[PDB]
Amino acid sequence: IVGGYTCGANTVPYQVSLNSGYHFCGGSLINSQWVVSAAHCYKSGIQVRLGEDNINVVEGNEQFISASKSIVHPSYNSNTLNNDIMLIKLKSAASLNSRVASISLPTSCASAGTQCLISGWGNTKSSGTSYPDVLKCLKAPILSDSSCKSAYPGQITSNMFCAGYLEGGKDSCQGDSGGPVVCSGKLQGIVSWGSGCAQKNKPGVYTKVCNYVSWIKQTIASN
Ligand SMILES: N=C(N)Nc1ccc(O)c(/C=N/CC/N=C/c2cc(NC(=N)N)ccc2O)c1
Ligand SMILES: [Ca+2]
Ligand SMILES: [Cu+2]
Secondary structure, eight states, X not given: OBSOEEOOTTSSTTEEEEESXXXXXXXXXXXXXXXXXXXXXXXXXXXXXXXXXSTTSOOSOOEEXXXXXXXXXXXXXXXXXXXXXXXXXXXXXXXXXXXXXXXXXXXXOOOTTOEEEEEESOOOOSSSOOOOSSOEEEEEEBOOXXXXXXXXXXXXXXTEEEESOTTOSOBOOXXXXXXXXXXXXXXXXXXXXXXXXXXXTBOEEEEEGGGXXXXXXXXXXXX
């Protein structure tokens, strides 16, 4: 997260860190046994880490649970990143409490202008590199589809939306990948892609979660 702020320990209870010996992606807990992330975050041997703030220090509220199965969206295209969403099932159900909680799925899509909360342990520099140990937060508005498409001609599909600032300076970045974009207590987006970080006229692009609720629910009900 570039140009954001320190969230505060466990203030984003649904935020998870996907670990394969090191943090490599964010994720969102949607129930005691499932996590939603980006398909481009796929890899084997994933351990889901819940209740995390400083990912390099055991602070007392963590729950480390290995993933038993990963399900990449049936239509995920790694070249265009269309349908950049993946479900991860935990080998054991997480113990839900005030610091480890699930985030609700949307009942309807959000609109341009809606203020949302984006979070993650990704790079904090627009130029250069610096990874934080504690969770970072950024409040940002969803941008109109027209402005998004104008920012990225020929690349924005109906399963994507832009959020952030066209002026730059505040955006998601490498490491935040797969993380949440929550608006009014609902998971509306997943950190998917962009061009560089916090660059002018290059806002972050996110997977439009509302288009996948049917698939998520049906998949969870049978796995
Ligand atoms: N675990 C692997 N080895 N795979 C892996 C997993 C996740 C990964 O992301 C990558 C690799 N990522 C390359 C860089 N992605 C930047 C990026 C930018 C933004 N936003 C922006 N405002 N530009 C959002 C998301 C992003 O990923 C490789
Ligand atoms: Ca920790
Ligand atoms: Cu990436």
